[PDB]
Amino acid sequence: MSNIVGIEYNRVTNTTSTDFPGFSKDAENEWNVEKFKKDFEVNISSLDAREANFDLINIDTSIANAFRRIMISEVPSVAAEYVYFFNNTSVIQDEVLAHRIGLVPLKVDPDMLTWVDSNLPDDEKFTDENTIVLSLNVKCTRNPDAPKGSTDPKELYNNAHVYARDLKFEPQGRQSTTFADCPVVPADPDILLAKLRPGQEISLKAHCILGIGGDHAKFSPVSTASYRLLPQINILQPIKGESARRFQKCFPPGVIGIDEGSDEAYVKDARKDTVSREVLRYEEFADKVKLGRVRNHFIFNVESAGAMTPEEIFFKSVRILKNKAEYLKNCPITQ
Template sequence: MVDNIVHIEQDRVTNTVSNDYPDTSISNAFRRIMISEVPSVAAEQVYIFNNTSVIQDEVLAHRIGLIPLKIDPDLLNWVDNSVDESDKFTDANTVVMTLDVSCTKNPNAPKNSTDPKELYRNSSIYARDLKFEPQGNQLENFKNPIEPADPDILLAKLRPGQEISLRIHCVLGIGSDHAKFSPVSTASYRLLPTIDIIEPIRGDDAKKFQKCFPTGVIGINNGEAFVKDSRRDTVSREVLRHEEFNGKVKLGRKRNHFIFNVESTGAMSPEEIFFKSVRILKNKAEYLRNCPIGR
């Protein structure tokens, strides 16, 4: 089904999907599953022991909850909410992280400096200051480091005498329960644009024709325009405003060819998110196929 990965970065991937039986609902199902049904790990409970900063406890807990965490969701079980609170969180379903920082004056600060980063120690608290506290056999089970996807997310600013001490329980969840569990920041798709040059376009008209499209869509070879990469087209239809191109070009979209753009929050790779959405949709189809008729 996935016939080509057009562009891939650490947290972003663009790939094309085509099938013989075009149905936009299937592509939209992938998009919705990636946003709301692919599980990831995020902070669920924040236990604040001491917070003398200017940021309120609720706001601090909210900011921590929205930090994407690099934790493989397949290594954790779902929390059983039917059990008592004391037995709910275990090493099999919960990752514990702590934050213990206090701000003090820097005795070696440069004279006449006004930069808080030079005047004080721990003047700014970032996501990198969250420390993983392994429970049970987690050190052996978790092969990769447990850390925030972006270490430079600012959590709070402190001044001498202020401190923060807290403990976090991170659990599995899905985006339909809370946006903090959604592994994507954007997930979208569009139909592949088609540009058919009916009559040759040459000379100065070719250069003008090229400027009617985004960079890289139209190329010029031996003075004649040709379609170089229709995927880059934004379907602005600017070319239709010019009389000299009337009847020489036909614009459209390929109805069974979809271009997906998936941008991850950093919790997992975007290609992993897409393939997990395929697996979830397949499981849904299998469930419906095996359901007794009439239920």
């Protein structure tokens, strides 16, 4: 019990739940919403765009994994799905160049589109409100200036490097007034996409649609989304004198610092100790330190690919876990 995962030099201990009635005779911690609503707290650390950092307290490690798997898979987004080629005489072959276009992020958010229905025949499948079309036409020619030889092939040739910003959004009908205030752009518009030499052109258009992340990893909105737990170091005997500086170079440089008054070690700013278990090797700190990791303090860290704010997907992950367990509260059980 006491919800502390026990780090030692070859194992970890009691990693499982033990939070259920029928574990001891005094069958406590039954389910109760008001007994849950008091202890659950959230502490938001440094928050900006394209990164979030926030804590979730006193939830069991079963449901903290449920929010990780939904941000990667279930929360939908947009990316390319069909690439139509005009004349391409570049050295990069077609369905490689059509594959690097699919993974490019887009700054348009979902909820602007509907789910495509592929049951229909393939000419009204792409309607006017579930698909935006974007294209590019670019040709490399010779630049007529006078440098000398062997210089940068950014001025011997004009536009000999194509970038992600070359995807000119080509708005179809019925949406020239809807996407007017916020046009779509690649979320990182400096991505190198191909290379050209004079006489070689690239001309295509793509039909980017609404897709689910767990189908293909074009569609995933996060860069990556995982979590940690809070580390915890206990000091049994006072380390004093010469040893406490030897005790200090076996850690990341922030986590423990010397008391400047009396030469004794204590814990500085925590949450920075990655578990290098370096104090286990030295057989003089075999009794002075009993370090661990608490089992109800999840250090989340989500990131975005550029489509939307990082505090939006974590709102949208918990919103669709409820609907995932609401859709089968309301359907009959067939025998």
